[PDB]
A paper describes a structure:
We show that BurG, an unusual NAD+-dependent member of the ketol-acid reductoisomerase family, constructs the strained cyclopropanol ring. Biochemical assays and a suite of eight crystal structures of native and mutated BurG with bound analogues and inhibitors provide snapshots of each step of the complex reaction mechanism, involving a concealed oxidoreduction and a C–S bond cleavage.
Apart from its function as a catalytic base, E232 also plays an active role in substrate recognition and positioning as we gleaned from crystallization assays with gonydiol and BurG. In one subset the active centre is populated by the enzymatic reaction products 6 and DMS. The second subset clearly depicts the backbone of gonydiol, which was oxidized into its enolate 14. Intermediate 14 is firmly held in place by ionic interaction of its sulfonium moiety with E232 and cation–π interaction with Y133. In addition, the glutamate residue (E232) would ionically interact with the positively charged sulfonium group to firmly position the substrate in the binding pocket. In the case of BurG, formation of 6 is probably driven by a gain in entropy and removal of the volatile DMS from the chemical equilibrium after cyclopropanol synthesis.
Residue numbers in the entry:
A (entry chain B): 3 to 341
B (entry chain A): 3 to 347
Amino acid sequence: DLIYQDEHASLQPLEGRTVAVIGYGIQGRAFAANLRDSGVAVRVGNIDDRYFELARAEGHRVTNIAEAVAHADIVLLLIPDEAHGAVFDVDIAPNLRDGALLCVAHGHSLVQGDVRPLPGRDLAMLAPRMYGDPIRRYYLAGQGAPAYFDIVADHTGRARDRVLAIARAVGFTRAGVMALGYRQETFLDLFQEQFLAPALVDLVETGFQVLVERGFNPKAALLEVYGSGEMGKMMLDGADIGLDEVVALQGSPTCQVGYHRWRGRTLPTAVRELAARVLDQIEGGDFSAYLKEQASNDYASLDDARRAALKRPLNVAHAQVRAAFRFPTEAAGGLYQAA
Amino acid sequence: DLIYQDEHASLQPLEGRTVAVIGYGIQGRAFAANLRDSGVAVRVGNIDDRYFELARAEGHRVTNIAEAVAHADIVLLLIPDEAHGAVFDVDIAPNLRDGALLCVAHGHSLVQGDVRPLPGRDLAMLAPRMYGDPIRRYYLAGQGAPAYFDIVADHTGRARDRVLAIARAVGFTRAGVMALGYRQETFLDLFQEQFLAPALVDLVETGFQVLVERGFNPKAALLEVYGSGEMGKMMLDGADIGLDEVVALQGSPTCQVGYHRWRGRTLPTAVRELAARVLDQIEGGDFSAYLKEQASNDYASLDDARRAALKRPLNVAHAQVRAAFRFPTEAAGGLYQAAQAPADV
Ligand SMILES: NC(=O)C1=CN([C@@H]2O[C@H](COP(=O)(O)OP(=O)(O)OC[C@H]3O[C@@H](n4cnc5c(N)ncnc54)[C@H](O)[C@@H]3O)[C@@H](O)[C@H]2O)C=CC1
Ligand SMILES: NC(=O)C1=CN([C@@H]2O[C@H](COP(=O)(O)OP(=O)(O)OC[C@H]3O[C@@H](n4cnc5c(N)ncnc54)[C@H](O)[C@@H]3O)[C@@H](O)[C@H]2O)C=CC1
Ligand SMILES: C[S+](C)CC/C(O)=C(/O)C(=O)O
Ligand SMILES: C[S+](C)CC/C(O)=C(/O)C(=O)O
Ligand SMILES: [Mg+2]
Ligand SMILES: [Mg+2]
Ligand SMILES: [Mg+2]
Ligand SMILES: [Mg+2]
């Protein structure tokens, strides 16, 4: 494996260059904020929506996407994946300067051919393994989250150092930036979203529902399965020292004996089988077809799913617990303004 | 529900009283540290092992258990649950002053009858919903983790305000301290440890195993299922705003569409049926009998299981990833030393 940390990257390739951040969403806002604080010239390209106004409110040079691209040496396409094709064809490809670098943060539009190499230009993936708020918070604490990168097309022969310069400016090299093919990244990322995340929340919810059914205090049931923060602390500490090691170090002997009674014994064969079926849906194009249908509406079906999830017993209990118990938080106002 | 925060508790009941922390392990160290920093007279009772020397290194007044109890108004029994019976019979019961309060941090020894009410004395549970390091880190940031409490025996009639005074001094009232019966706490706590924690790690491990079998880069597989910290951040942010809400707020539309394709649909009935089986084993005494067997030869079988778990593919991959990728950590050196705060803090 090729893994790049700060010792393996430099801001030198960004000297005298302008980065156009296309989109000012979860990733775009974090990239724009960290690039600016790292002393990189940055401008934002965005359509006429609330994100345009937010970028203006946070002191950025904001224009339509075509104008941002026409005035940029490096272009980061940080909008939803189903929107890449139309924005690439209409706004990006006609305005991308000779020798300019275009980056995506997910392989999906590359796999589908909605973003393609252009003669005379560079194309890459820099895919963070983290959502925006923590990328921003880590950055300000002198920390970073991991990322994967791939050099898809390199006309200039300088794409690798320019991609890794962006990665250093945004903080990912403080953890590590590993070479991984855009196709593998696509399938791996979608697998985490479609198998692991829903199975994890379904498992937490199953614990909650069995306890409430069996006559346990619903607030206490919600607190134990995640609401206390304990199970989240175990998973985040586990990223540092190992999940079994969190139990060995931090668990009472009562806890450790119970945990090891059931470790490797809790799940039916159906879980491993579902994992394989989800990968079949991803690798074979079935999920990509489903996503295209879901987007064809401005995501009307997703809006209905989001609203329905808030009515589930776990989420009704969440609101009751959160109103009754203070959770440790840090103030987020002004997080994305200039340091 | 009865939920106490800082405005429902005071340190007044600890004025002129001494707290004996019995044990200096995961909970004992956090209780002793937070009590000292809250200005409470605290001493540590411990056997002759490494924890005695750690308590001394960290600046505490340390003695054997009998001596600590004989000189205390409030006694916190923060040693492993299977050890409560012998220590209670030999060291605590003969030395507990008239009107003293004994507290446990888990209901198990009360359920088993290894710790019992004593004439003229108070007995309570104060059970943190968190392990020691976060209790300590939260305390130093002016924050706390939740706890459950129960008043089991109240000779004095002042047990409730003394238990909540301890909870305020240690930080739990900054989140909330809720009344919950010691028997319910026991079964609920053991259920989290025996169903939920191993099922969560088994699921992460299953994701890792299938990805490696299907030809994915093992470091990348390990990072996505937990190693990046992303899934832990989602669970911890989820504690604040809700788990479905984290996806709605922080997920790309691609992520949200994929998540909601399977949300509420991933698990067959065998999972909730196994959860009920674990609860049956807990409620009916089967786990309690297993625990007593396992505590034989000082938990020899658990030592074997711990060592064996380090060599599982997930943990071999963990070591490879953690050597290749830097993870954001905060320095832990001196975390449990006295923490004098400057004017700005
Ligand atoms: N959300 C995350 O934390 C991560 C996302 N990514 C990738 O980063 C990229 C950005 O995703 P997010 O930041 O989550 O998206 P988002 O949902 O936050 O995107 C909002 C932004 O997209 C723009 N936008 C939306 N529809 C548009 C359209 N039709 N035409 C032009 N602009 C449009 C909005 O104006 C706004 O600036 C995606 O390729 C995603 O897969 C990868 C790593 C993590
Ligand atoms: N570990 C945790 O974060 C939590 C633990 N608890 C409860 O807190 C209590 C303490 O558990 P932990 O701190 O995890 O235990 P631990 O494993 O850290 O206990 C170590 C301490 O116990 C003492 N000890 C061990 N065996 C002994 C014996 N035979 N006689 C006398 N002292 C002995 C040691 O000298 C040391 O002071 C238990 O009742 C546990 O259920 C409840 C909430 C969370
Ligand atoms: C990793 S956590 C579930 C261990 C800390 C905790 O809350 C307990 O009840 C215990 O250790 O017995
Ligand atoms: C809760 S996390 C898995 C969402 C952030 C993330 O890593 C993505 O790949 C995405 O949003 O598309
Ligand atoms: Mg991702
Ligand atoms: Mg426990
Ligand atoms: Mg517990
Ligand atoms: Mg994604």
